[PDB]
């Protein structure tokens, strides 16, 4: 057991970190480098992230916490919490002599319940109204600089979601790193900011003979004995009279020879991923090699061609009037700092639209979708025959951690609200009665923007009832290779 | 300091918690005057183990008020006390105030008083039967003598028949216990009046005198002296001389040696002779009254007993036999365990089924009471609640069965309205019986002054937050 | 000495912990920590002992001892340790009670003669496959753990003719079956109870224009693995043209080389054609026009089974070295009929009754994706485990009722020998008893109840041998409580308890006989 | 809680080492030495535990019930502590493996019931077997007690003397009711019986050609009185000048011892014994007088005479009288070695007597003083018991089996308790092969194994290194002693068990 208790301690001490830096009043910490400086933050993403631990166990915690990341760029500090939060329950572990296999039995019937407890309380939104989008995606807006255009921030973050989702092929598949680049571009402000409903590529412009602005170009996808070839596999691509040529490895320096010869834009270095967003922007087809090429390759239906410098840096838009399952934000500001602000705030937001257009539900957060949970399996513990009821009862004790730390970040009287919001969830319906994180009084939800999507809170058990498995199921540490 | 407190009065539950139901452990205690014994009473362990931590002993003098108007459920303040204890941190860590405990607690003490008689099962006939005494008797003897519950449950049985008549008279002092060196349980008896195991020094096996005394050609006329009082009965405290033995049995004097002090004093508050420190002076006021002095024989030894033939007669004493003077202590406790037992079924007859039956229905009903009831005491009403299930816990683990697989089935029964349901007791069946069947019935009055001490122990040691010394 | 045999038994001993807990399919997790610091964790005894390094000498005989059960047995070499490790750890008392260890290995060698003979005379043939079940209770009782299991008679009779169907012999009578098991689909049919077993291997392709009739009742089925559209010389080296107007010609003469691969490829009558690459879109009007079932860009795994059922050859090019022919007669297999279902959302095409297939495939039909994922690894794992039984020609009930049999058998006839071996055979059969007393702390039960319960059974058996007596009595961890392998279909095969007894009595013989260490 | 346990189960296995190489006849020895620096030499197990006086708790335990292992029985205490010790070590890697203790006592109380069903069905009646004489029978079981000793040539001889002294006394047998005298000098088949009380006498004084050593009914009587003349309990001197005054001074010496003999007359004492020595002044009044006086007889002999003669050991003269005077019907005075011995024979209350040995050297006689302690009891328990069992560990072979069959149809945590109580029997026989310098693996892995071929009396031979039939060999043990020891054991075992925790008043 002694191996089955030191798992309690390496991640209830992890879960002590960042039980503080929850909600909005979210405490600050203090992390001493080595170099004497110290970084003032107070995400637990990147406190624990470099925050070096010697027990393997606490080690999980972490790779567990950046699959989180790229799921949903936030409510990974209560994964942790709760996972750390499941296991302080000694009491069951080892005083009651209890084998860990009965507790996983418990953790995982308890894990089918708390599912279909939260959408019991759930509600569906009118994604075609903005102004109730709005309501939503304002929670991240909120405390950050972009308040002064959230209106541009949710233009930006709600439609950029829409050009990546795909409702002809059932699943509804919505992918940021593919179909949704992220790009900056220097000078103006964020008033500036818009998102180009296209394909933009961050290649600058070498050669002074390249077409400038083309209102309908033409995209083509693809010493003696040295320049016979050379010359060849150039004059291959103007037999259909293109105005930017885009290649997938790098052109060589007397293939540009070329193409400065013709004073047609010169693309190299481009992803397979982008060639296929143009491919279905302008029509094109991605041949294997120049020499190939045939008539359908071609940018008919293609907005423009301009390789403008705008901001001292040449950006290649090749933008047009259609949303071929991709899209292009355009980020603009007058200083790098100001760019970082926003780039990484929208990813917050962003990040909301996917969980709600994939599952148009929403939960009543601020510590009313905890309460609403545990007051639905305590009745359940009452009526469960077996010796699992004990940790089932548990975890019904063990969620309320998430709004005890509300209060107590407020610094109101965490014991005497939280004893009372038992009591509205007893009496009244559980989907109302939350929990003020700026107030620390008790407020409904349908009156307050603190409503979450159901994704985020459905991976957040998930994992946060899997980590406490994947630990509890250890009972030896083997050392070797 | 309060968390030191609560750790010091668990280290006091863990001395009682094996020692408690029929399958408890014996404790190997060691006495002050250099001897050895094992018992399993836990009002014997701590009258040899020096309780000096001062937030533990406010449970002990808990369990002195438990032998006024109650002689058992000792072990329920000691156990059901460390339980409120135990899951009081779990309250304080969280952020809990010590003051809403307090008034939580007293809260469910008034609680519990108003479901417990719902719980009553059944009720003593009080048909002063030898079958109804042992049949509802075969409870409070076991856990303290077990396996020999047949023989000791109907002999007390015997006893307090005899007393019930006399109502408004029965007490423990009017059945005393006298146990002799002999083979085993088989031997032992119940006679009437008083009864010691040293027989007759003199010739006289029978004298009808009414006045008894306690306390070469000189001491000849001094035993005369006692005849000349009207005293046909002497009782020497220390050794007779060898000329005093013979002069008793000329004038057909019983004589009489009691070595024991306590077999002295007992005289003096029956008969009324009391013990003079003079060579036996002629000395009438300070001489008994009895009916009859015979000596009788039972059981192969001859014992003499004060049989008062014309009064009533309200005084019983067991005669015990075992080989072993310490299995004997164990013999006796067992006896004034039972004794008491039904020194509280002379008021109001209320019986409630044991072995953790009532434990879970009385916690069943006060965990429904405390989610309906809202308030900051809500989180003390619960725990004591699940305090009561310790108590269950103790007969789990001492019959070595798993106390989770007790918990559950204890509640899924009274969840289909099972009621009158405890644990089995034995150790290779970890499932349930009824209590009723079996005759398994605890006393209710007990159980009113046990939770009411218990719980008055555990906000005395929770109103107080630290011990700081002083002096005159 | 002895203190040198003292430390080299809990050398092993302890190796045997490392694997004690994660015995059974309950098995505890464990953190394997290499080199660099990285956590792998599992609970496979296997993987635990192949990585574990542990540099004691007495433990790397426990090393080689894996090597032989995973290249015989392949599977529960986990318990090979564990019986071993107790035989040393009651030897070692042995040697405190002035024993030598030869008269130890002496009765541990003899030991074994009779635990396989033993197990020999309490043996059931391969049998029960149709007329009897153990066959829907071994199934179903597998797949309780998963989603499937909430009308397990449903699912567990499509199990049974699954294997029925993968049986073919082939060598001397050998009766097994193959790596290739029962390609499983999925789809939409609104409900979980929509499974349909189909008797015969399942493309999921379609054909493209809906012109093409779905009703091919011609036997020669075209394989190819050439893709008949413009094909290319190499996707690294392209040919080089210094001419547009050289590009026409070959760009025209290739689709002219295609209007003669058309006719030979239709000219060996095959209306089902297969291609990998994929089909020009003018080369699948002519099959509109004769009427030929065509499919395009099918998986070559998928054609690789296609090939198998019907016999087919799967032609890699069609220009054997000199020009372009079709390889006719060599390329085409033997069907019966395939039609092309309309299954939910997915037409799937159907072969039935083909040269020589030997294999089958499950719809799982479903509501979502959820689901039928759950659905696939059950009866996936499922199959492998009535697979493993009925390929062994004989097998045996395990799961503790070998082990508590041979616990009074082999305690009676220690017995019947003597001669200074008797504590020897006593300790040898009562080291097997860990085996069950393992599995019980693994499946949350109390450890000393469950094994008197077989052996309190176990032992019936051989007083008399009425049928009162409970034979062949297993236990079962999902219940926590000892079942008749007869009817529940917990069986085992044989030479896995014969070679597990067999090394782990050797292997603990070679650690008994080393007495000093030497180094250097 | 647990640690306790183990604390205790040690504690108690050191006792039993104390006395583990003690068990058999041919045990060894040891050698405690009190406070005085006195040397004790014992074999006998009880006796070791009586003299060490282990303060430790729990190893008194086990003392309690030795002790009355040796009030009701007087033999084979040891078993009954390496037993009980056995039944804590078996049990010793289950307490730790998370077992319950008062489980155990539930097994132990299961086996040992179940001992008692199997001893009394398996044991035999024997009262007139085969057609045999009980004297027959008795010297058979007796002379194999005698065997592989320096008297085994002469065996024969000494085991009818040993019929002769049981039959002589009473229905009530006790073994300290007859008395063993060592005489040094002669052979070995000299050794003469005594059928009543008599002793050394080592009256070397005067009183020749008188003093008839024939009654027919003597008043013995038994005096502490030192008739010497030059006595330091009698004497006179009184430190005068006057001469005539010196003359009633050595008068008055004689008249102390004088007044007091004549009192010995008057009494009607005919055979006068006395402890203290008496002097060769005051032996010629009783020869003038016709009476017989022998003196220097030790107190213990008179305590075996009180017991025959049926009198009172007085310590003062005056009170001599018909009260105390005991009476006997022959009373002679024999020879044996040359040797004067008087004894009384053919009294009312003879219920003891005495047996002299012979031989040339004094350790032939030790050897032959343990023996008869064994072969006497052997006598005394198979008239008690017909119903008896094999010895020699016979018994404790067959419950091992029967209590390991019927272990493996007991489901539940009973089977490895009672299982292991099955292993725990094994060490009476272990301890015979060890204590008797035999290799115990050859035998108890031969012995173990005869009983499933159809053994049901094979048992330990302590002679030869092998097997034998105890019972048909006449080596026998009583079946209700075993059963009492049993019960004695599992008692001893289960009131350790029953303890958790030690408690101690602080002083
Ligand atoms: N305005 C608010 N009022 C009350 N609670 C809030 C509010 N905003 C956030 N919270 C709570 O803070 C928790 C953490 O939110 P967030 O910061 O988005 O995730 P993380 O802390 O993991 O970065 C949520 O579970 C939510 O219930
Ligand atoms: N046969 C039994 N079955 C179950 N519980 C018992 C039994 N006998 C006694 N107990 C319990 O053990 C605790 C102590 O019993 P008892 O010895 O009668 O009182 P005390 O220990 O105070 O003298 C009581 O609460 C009682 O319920």
């Known amino acids: 057991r002694k191996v089955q208790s030191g798992n309690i301690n390496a991640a209830k001490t992890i879960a002590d970190i960042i039980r503080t830096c929850l909600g909005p009043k979210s405490m600050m910490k203090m992390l001493l480098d080595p170099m004497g400086g110290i970084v003032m933050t107070n995400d637990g993403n990147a406190i624990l992230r470099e925050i070096q631990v010697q027990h393997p166990a606490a080690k999980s915690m972490i790779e567990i916490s950046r699959t989180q990341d790229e799921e949903v760029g936030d409510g990974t500090t209560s994964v942790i919490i709760l996972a750390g939060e499941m296991l302080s329950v000694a009491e069951h572990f080892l005083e009651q002599q209890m084998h860990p296999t009965v507790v996983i039995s418990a953790y995982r019937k308890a894990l089918d319940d708390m599912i279909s407890t939260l959408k019991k309380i759930s509600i569906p939104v009118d994604i075609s109204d903005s102004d109730m989008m709005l309501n939503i995606i304002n929670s991240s807006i909120t405390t950050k600089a972009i308040s002064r255009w959230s209106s541009l921030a949710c233009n930006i973050a709600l439609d950029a979601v829409k050009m990546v989702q795909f409702e002809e092929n059932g699943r509804k598949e919505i992918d940021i790193k593919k179909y949704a680049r992220v790009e900056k571009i220097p000078g103006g402000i964020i008033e500036d900011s818009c998102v180009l409903r296209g394909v933009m590529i961050n290649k600058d412009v070498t050669h002074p003979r390249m077409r400038r602005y083309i209102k309908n170009p033409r995209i083509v996808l693809l010493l003696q004995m040295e320049e016979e070839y050379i010359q060849q596999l150039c004059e291959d691509i103007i037999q259909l009279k293109p105005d930017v040529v885009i290649t997938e490895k790098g052109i060589s320096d007397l293939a540009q020879h070329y193409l400065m010869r013709a004073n047609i834009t010169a693309i190299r270095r481009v992803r397979k991923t982008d060639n296929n967003r143009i491919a279905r922007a302008c029509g094109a087809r991605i041949v294997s090699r120049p020499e190939e090429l045939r008539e359908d390759d071609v940018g008919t239906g293609a907005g423009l061609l301009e390789i403008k410098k705008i901001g001292d840096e040449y950006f290649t838009f090749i933008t047009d009037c259609k949303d071929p399952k991709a899209c292009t934000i355009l980020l603009r500001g007058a200083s790098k700092e100001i760019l970082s602000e926003v780039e990484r705030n929208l990813q917050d937001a962003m990040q909301v639209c996917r969980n709600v257009l994939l599952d148009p539900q929403l939960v009543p957060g601020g510590g009313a979708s905890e309460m609403a949970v545990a007051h639905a399996l305590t009745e359940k513990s009452k009526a469960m025959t077996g010796v699992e009821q004990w940790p089932y009862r548990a975890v019904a004790q063990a969620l309320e951690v998430i709004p005890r730390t509300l209060i107590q970040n407020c610094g109101a009287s965490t014991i005497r609200l939280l004893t009372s919001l038992r009591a509205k969830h007893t009496q009244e319906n559980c989907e109302t009665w939350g929990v003020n994180g700026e107030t620390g009084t008790l407020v409904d939800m349908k009156e307050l923007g603190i409503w979450e999507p159901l994704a985020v809170k459905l991976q957040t058990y998930k994992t946060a009832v899997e980590t406490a498995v994947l630990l509890l199921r250890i009972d030896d540490i083997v050392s070797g290779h | 300091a309060v968390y030191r407190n609560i750790q010091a009065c668990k280290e006091l539950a863990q001395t009682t918690r094996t020692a408690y139901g029929p399958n408890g452990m014996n404790k190997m205690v060691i006495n002050h005057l250099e001897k050895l014994f094992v018992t399993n009473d836990a009002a014997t362990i701590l009258r040899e183990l020096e309780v000096q931590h001062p937030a533990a002993k406010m449970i002990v003098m808990a369990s002195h008020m438990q032998e006024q108007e109650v002689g058992d459920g000792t072990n329920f303040v000691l156990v059901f006390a460390g339980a409120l204890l135990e899951l009081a941190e779990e309250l304080l860590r969280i952020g809990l105030s010590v003051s809403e405990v307090i008034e939580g607690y007293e809260i469910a003490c008034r609680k519990a008083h108003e479901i417990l008689p719902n719980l009553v099962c059944c009720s003593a006939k009080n048909l002063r039967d030898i079958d109804e005494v042992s049949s509802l008797l075969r409870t409070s003897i076991m856990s303290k003598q077990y396996g020999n519950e047949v023989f000791l449950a109907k002999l007390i049985a015997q006893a307090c028949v005899s007393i019930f008549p006399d109502s408004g008279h029965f007490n423990v002092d009017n059945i005393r216990v006298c146990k002799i060196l002999g083979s085993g349980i088989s031997s032992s008896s119940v006679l009437h009046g008083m009864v010691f195991k040293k027989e007759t020094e003199g010739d006289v096996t029978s004298v009808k005198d009414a006045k008894i005394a306690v306390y070469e050609n000189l001491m000849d006329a001094q035993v005369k002296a006692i005849a000349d009082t009207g005293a046909n009965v002497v009782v020497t405290g220390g050794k007779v001389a060898d000329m005093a033995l013979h002069y008793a049995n000329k004038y057909n004097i019983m004589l009489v040696r009691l070595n024991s002090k306590w077999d002295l004093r007992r005289l003096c508050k029956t008969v009324g002779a009391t013990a003079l420190p003079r060579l036996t002076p002629p000395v009438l006021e300070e001489m008994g009254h009895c009916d009859s002095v015979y000596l009788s024989e039972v059981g192969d030894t001859q014992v003499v007993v004060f049989k008062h033939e014309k009064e009533d007669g309200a005084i019983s004493t067991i005669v015990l036999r075992g080989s072993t003077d310490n299995l004997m202590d164990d013999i006796e406790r067992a006896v004034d365990d039972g004794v008491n037992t039904f020194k509280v079924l002379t008021r109001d007859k209320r019986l409630v089924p044991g072995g953790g039956a009532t434990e879970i229905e009385l916690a069943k009903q006060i965990t429904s009471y405390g989610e309906t009831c809202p308030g900051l005491e809500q989180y003390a009403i619960k725990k004591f609640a699940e305090a009561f299930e310790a108590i269950p816990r103790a007969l789990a683990e001492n019959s070595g069965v798993k106390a989770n697989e007790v918990i559950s089935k204890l509640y899924a029964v009274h969840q289909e309205g099972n009621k009158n349901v405890g644990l089995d007791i034995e150790a290779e069946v970890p499932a349930v019986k009824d209590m009723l069947e079996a005759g398994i019935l605890d006393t209710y009055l007990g159980k009113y002054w046990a939770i009411k001490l218990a719980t008055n122990a555990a906000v005395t040691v929770l109103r107080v937050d630290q011990i700081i010394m002083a002096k005159p | ?520 | 809680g647990i640690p306790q346990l183990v604390s205790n189960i040690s504690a108690c296995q050191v006792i039993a080492e104390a006395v583990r190489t003690t068990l058999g006849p041919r045990g060894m020895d040891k050698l405690i030495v009190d406070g005085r620096g006195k040397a004790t030499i014992s074999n006998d197990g009880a006796t070791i535990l009586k003299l060490l006086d282990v303060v430790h708790p729990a190893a008194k335990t086990l003392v309690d019930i030795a002790k009355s292992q040796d009030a009701e029985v007087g033999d084979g205490t040891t078993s009954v502590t390496l037993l009980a010790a056995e039944f804590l070590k078996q049990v010793k890697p289950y307490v730790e493996e998370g077992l319950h203790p008062q489980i155990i006592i539930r097994a132990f109380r299961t086996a040992t019931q179940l001992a008692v069903n199997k001893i009394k069905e398996i044991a035999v009646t024997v009262k007139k077997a085969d057609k045999v004489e009980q004297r027959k029978l008795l010297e058979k079981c007796a002379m194999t007690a005698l065997s592989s000793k320096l008297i085994s040539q002469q065996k024969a001889f000494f085991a009818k003397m040993v019929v002769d002294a049981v039959m002589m006394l009473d229905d009530l047998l006790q073994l300290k009711m007859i008395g063993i005298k060592k005489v040094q000098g002669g052979a070995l088949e000299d050794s003469q019986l005594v059928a009543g009380v008599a002793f050394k006498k080592t009256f070397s004084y005067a009183g020749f050609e008188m003093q008839p050593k024939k009654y027919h009914n003597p008043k013995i009587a038994l005096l502490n009185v030192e008739l010497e003349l030059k006595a330091e309990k009698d004497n006179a001197e009184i430190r005068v000048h006057t001469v005539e005054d010196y003359q009633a001074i050595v008068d008055a010496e004689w008249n102390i011892l004088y007044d007091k003999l004549e009192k010995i007359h008057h009494s009607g004492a005919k055979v006068v014994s006395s402890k203290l020595p008496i002097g060769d002044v005051a032996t010629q009044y009783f020869a003038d007088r016709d009476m017989f006086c022998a003196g220097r007889v030790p107190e213990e002999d008179l305590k075996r005479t009180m017991m025959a003669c049926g009198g009172s050991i007085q310590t003062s003269v005056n009170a001599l009288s018909a009260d105390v005077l005991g009476r006997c019907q022959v009373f002679e005075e024999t020879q044996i070695g040359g040797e004067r011995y008087n004894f009384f024979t053919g009294c009312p209350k003879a219920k003891t007597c005495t047996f002299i040995l012979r031989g040339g050297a004094e350790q032939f006689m030790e050897e032959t003083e343990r023996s008869l302690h064994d072969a006497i009891m052997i006598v005394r328990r198979a008239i008690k018991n017909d119903s008896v069992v094999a010895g020699g560990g016979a018994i404790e072979m067959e419950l091992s089996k029967y209590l390991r069959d019927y272990s493996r149809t007991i489901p539940g945590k009973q089977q490895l308790l009672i299982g292991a109580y099955a292993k725990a029997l094994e060490i009476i026989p272990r301890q015979l092969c060890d204590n008797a310098g035999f290799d115990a693996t050859n035998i108890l892995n031969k012995l173990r194994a005869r009983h499933a071929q159809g053994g049901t009396w094979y048992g330990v031979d302590i002679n030869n290194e092998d097997i034998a039939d105890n019972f048909e060999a006449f080596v026998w043990e009583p079946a209700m002693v075993r059963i009492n020891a049993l019960t004695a054991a599992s008692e001893a075992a289960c009131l350790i068990v029953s303890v958790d925790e030690t408690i101690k008043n602080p002083r």
């Open chain 3, 1 to 520: 000495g002895e203190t040198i045999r003292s430390q080299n038994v809990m050398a092993a001993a302890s190796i045997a912990n490392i694997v004690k807990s994660s015995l059974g399919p309950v098995g505890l997790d464990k953190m394997l920590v290499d080199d660099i610091g990285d956590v792998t964790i599992t609970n496979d005894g296997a993987t635990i002992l192949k990585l574990l390094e542990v540099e004691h000498p007495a433990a790397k005989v426990l090393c080689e001892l894996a090597d032989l059960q995973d290249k015989e047995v392949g599977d529960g070499t986990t318990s090979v340790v564990i019986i071993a490790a107790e035989l040393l750890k009651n030897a070692d008392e042995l040697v405190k009670q002035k024993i030598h260890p030869t008269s130890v290995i002496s009765g541990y060698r003899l030991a074994c003669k009779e635990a396989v003979r033993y197990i020999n005379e309490n043996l059931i043939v391969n049998t029960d496959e149709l007329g009897r079940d153990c066959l829907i209770n071994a199934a179903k009782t597998s797949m309780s753990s998963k989603i499937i299991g909430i009308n397990g008679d449903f699912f567990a009779n499509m199990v049974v003719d699954a294997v029925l169907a993968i049986k073919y012999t082939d060598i001397r009578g050998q009766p097994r079956y193959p790596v290739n098991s029962v390609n499983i689909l999925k789809a939409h049919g609104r409900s979980q109870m929509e499974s349909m077993l189909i008797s015969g291997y399942a493309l999921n392709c379609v054909v493209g224009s809906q012109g093409m009739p779905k009703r091919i009742v011609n036997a020669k089925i075209a394989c190819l693995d050439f893709s008949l559209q413009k094909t290319k010389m190499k996707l690294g080296v392209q040919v080089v043209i210094t001419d547009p107007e050289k590009l026409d010609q070959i760009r025209q003469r290739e689709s002219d080389i295609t209007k003669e691969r058309i006719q030979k490829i239709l000219a060996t009558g095959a209306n089902v054609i297969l291609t990998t690459g994929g089909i020009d879109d003018m080369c699948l009007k002519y099959f509109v026009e004769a009427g030929a079932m065509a499919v395009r860009r099918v998986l070559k795994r998928d054609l690789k089974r296609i090939a198998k059922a019907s016999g087919a050859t799967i032609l890699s090019t069609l220009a054997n070295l000199e020009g372009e022919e079709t390889f006719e007669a060599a390329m085409l297999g033997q069907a019966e009929e395939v039609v092309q279902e309309r299954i939910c959302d997915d037409e799937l095409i159907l072969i039935k009754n083909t040269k020589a297939r030997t294999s089958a495939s499950i719809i799982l039909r479903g509501a979502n994706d959820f689901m039928c994922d759950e659905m696939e690894r059950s009866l996936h794992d499922a199959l492998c485990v009535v697979k493993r039984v009925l390929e062994s020609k004989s097998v045996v009930p395990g799961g503790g009722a070998v082990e508590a049999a041979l616990s009074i058998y082999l305690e009676n006839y220690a017995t019947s020998m003597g001669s200074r071996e008797q504590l020897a055979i006593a300790e040898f059969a009562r080291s097997l008893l860990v085996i069950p007393n393992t599995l019980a702390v693994n499946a949350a039960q109390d450890s000393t109840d469950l094994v008197a319960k077989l052996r309190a059974f176990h032992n019936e058996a051989q007083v008399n041998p009425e049928r009162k007596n409970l034979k062949w009595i297993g236990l079962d961890l999902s219940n926590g409580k000892p079942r008749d392998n007869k009817q529940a279909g917990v069986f085992e095969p044989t030479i896995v308890k014969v070679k597990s007894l067999k090394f782990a009595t050797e292997a603990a013989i070679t650690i008994l006989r080393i007495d000093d260490l030497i180094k250097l």
